[PDB]
Amino acid sequence: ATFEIVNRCSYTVWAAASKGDAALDAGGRQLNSGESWTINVEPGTNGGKIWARTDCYFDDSGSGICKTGDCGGLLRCKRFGRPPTTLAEFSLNQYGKDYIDISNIKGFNVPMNFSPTTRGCRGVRCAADIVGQCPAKLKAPGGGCNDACTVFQTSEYCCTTGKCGPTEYSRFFKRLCPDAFSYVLDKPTTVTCPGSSNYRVTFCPTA
Template identity: 65%
Template sequence: MQPGTKQARIWPRTKCNFDGSGRGKCETGDCGGLLECKAFGQPPNTLAEYALNQFGKKDFFDISLVDGFNVPMEFSPTSNGFSRGIKCTADINGQCPNQLKAPGGCHNPCTVFKTDEYCCNSGKCGPTNLSRFFKDRCRDAYSYPKDDPTSTFTCPEGTNYRVIFCP
């Protein structure tokens, strides 16, 4: 990760099958049928998001469930004396509300219902019963698009990080 990287994301893909030319499909997190992603993954997928060396010489990082959930994740600083990482390790797929269930994962309500209440398109929204399903199980993770106060974490610039799928 290069300093100054803005709006980057890492996500797991599951049940993938690719041919020798790098074409195929994944059950979750698919990137338009390509082995080497050129666009964001298809929901549902758990996201690690980061922006390095941004405002006030800080790195910003989070785990987001705004695109749903497919596998547990941990995102941790590994240098500069910081060790408090964030994680989402709950059994969200097993407990997923019926209306959000998807093959291999659990959709976020915005993906399913596409309403302003869940997607925050007007810029104003708050937690809903369905977003609370995610927040109750993963306190550190974004559960809806405006969940900044409890879901964005910072470290000084130059910190190293580790993302672990299925910790």
């Protein structure tokens, strides 16, 4: 499956793609404002994620650091990124269908639209100014808006016991972005697409 990653932000971002235990395609690449990078993800990929990283510095070997979404200091991500990270999530060819969603469970750093480039389903989007409107206690000094689990580490925010409800903090993310997961047990906003669909992830879509 192809995923065209487009950066419509006025600032550079370093795209990242991983399934947690391995990189997807090259795993990561710099995207200056306006640039597009197309990656290929193997069919059957379960639990894949794509996200943006901001304010990164990498050396010749591809090692360094990013203020948001850093994945073990690597340009080419092999693992998931450090919150806050707006997440485009997908599981492909799961019993004949693809499943996509956007999640704010790990916080928000950059606005995003995640849509299919093929027929059969609609896209999802979270493009509100969550960083600008972020509640004081969730603001990440390093940049972005942290999720409450990251900030407070409680069973309720982290939904560790599998028994949790919405919170004042999750409601903030849900209010700004109704179409993205605001907490672990949020009412699903996952879209079912035809198996083997292709997609486009756009950072700063309303730009």
